[PDB]
Design a protein around this ligand. Structure first.
Ligand SMILES: Nc1ncnc2c1ncn2[C@H]1C[C@H](O)[C@@H](COP(=O)(O)OP(=O)(O)OP(=O)(O)O)O1
Ligand SMILES: Nc1ncnc2c1ncn2[C@H]1C[C@H](O)[C@@H](COP(=O)(O)OP(=O)(O)OP(=O)(O)O)O1
Ligand SMILES: Nc1ncnc2c1ncn2[C@@H]1O[C@H](COP(=O)(O)OP(=O)(O)O)[C@@H](O)[C@H]1O
Ligand SMILES: Nc1ncnc2c1ncn2[C@@H]1O[C@H](COP(=O)(O)OP(=O)(O)O)[C@@H](O)[C@H]1O
Ligand SMILES: [Mg+2]
Ligand SMILES: [Mg+2]
Ligand SMILES: [Zn+2]
Ligand SMILES: [Zn+2]
Lengths: 149, 149
């Protein structure tokens, strides 16, 4: 990298330690031209926040996982492929607007529930049956009554 | 093929016409050893009946198409992978027991509905919502009331 003082396009690396407790790499660099030393930090930049799953396992944001769940609930429903992509881009925008490096998968689920509530109410019931995990048939009718309010 | 009269392991083909209106190939064969002639018919043997789709399109029986639909409805349900395979083999046995060369996809759907009715009643409602195509939220509660009888 460019020397921050003289501006030689290349500096030699002097040291490499894991100072951010694994999260970051600290390096020392020396300029060949002006013989000056400087510290650098190498940090990871995520395109989308990492997802914290129900079992506290961290995994990368998977657009396909998000899409498939919606498409399953929107089977035989009058929602175009554009409406789905339009809802996915808005959910992505909402997860970025939090500013968080990681987001609970429950948050992704609630965002999908709000898109489906606007898109199709049958698709909403289908997704809620697996998302909220209805363990009884009664649970189905109780979620329909919840939607009338 | 073997001559049906003398039993020479090979006979020469004399003619080839599409007599079964495409469904069958008729051939004439002459034996090299005894100089006798005989007619043969070549017919297609299906492992499982071909499926007539809702739009009258004929397509081969796809075990994966059958399985996926069940697995979608059985999401987060206490039905083991063995229970699913046990239900699929029984549905396959039932389609073969008809003796038909082709079966309506509606018949495959009703068979899955009866397996899910035995396996899990929440999975049954999930599959019925896409299979019977609920076009309204009311349709959901009306199918729950149908199950109580
Ligand atoms: N058959 C279905 N009908 C309606 N909605 C469904 C169906 N299957 C899944 N969904 C919805 C509700 C679920 O909470 C959501 C995500 O499904 P799930 O199988 O948990 O996938 P996922 O994207 O979370 O990946 P993972 O395999 O890592 O859990 O999709
Ligand atoms: N999300 C879902 N929840 C519950 N059951 C589902 C879900 N998606 C599909 N099913 C059930 C009901 C459907 O009638 C059945 C078959 O689904 P469908 O998409 O029509 O596939 P298929 O096997 O008929 O293939 P094809 O793509 O040729 O129509 O599976
Ligand atoms: N890695 C991921 N990236 C994007 N969406 C995800 C991811 N994992 C799960 N989802 C979505 O989060 C929502 C809720 O998932 P859920 O099944 O409740 O969580 P989990 O996978 O933690 O058990 C669904 O819309 C699902 O498709
Ligand atoms: N080619 C196939 N082979 C096996 N099962 C199939 C096939 N096509 C559809 N099915 C199954 O038939 C049932 C009803 O399908 P449905 O969606 O009602 O019909 P269609 O595909 O004709 O629109 C479901 O269990 C589905 O998975
Ligand atoms: Mg999941
Ligand atoms: Mg189908
Ligand atoms: Zn320098
Ligand atoms: Zn012969």
């Amino acid at each position: 990298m460019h020397c921050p003082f003289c501006f030689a396009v290349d500096t030699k690396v002097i040291d490499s330690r894991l100072v951010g407790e694994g999260s970051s790499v600290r390096r020392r660099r020396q300029c060949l031209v002006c013989n000056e030393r400087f510290t650098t930090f190498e940090v990871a930049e995520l395109v989308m926040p990492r997802v914290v799953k129900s079992n506290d396992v961290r995994e990368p944001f998977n657009e396909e996982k998000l899409r498939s769940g919606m498409l399953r609930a929107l089977e035989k429903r009058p929602v175009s492929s554009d409406d789905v992509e339009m809802a996915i881009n808005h959910i992505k925008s909402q997860l970025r607007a939090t500013g968080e490096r990681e987001v609970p998968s429950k948050m992704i689920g609630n965002l999908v529930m709000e898109q489906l509530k606007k898109l199709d109410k049958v698709a909403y019931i289908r997704f809620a049956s697996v998302y909220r995990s209805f363990e009884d048939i009664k649970d189905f009718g109780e979620e329909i009554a919840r939607l009338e309010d």
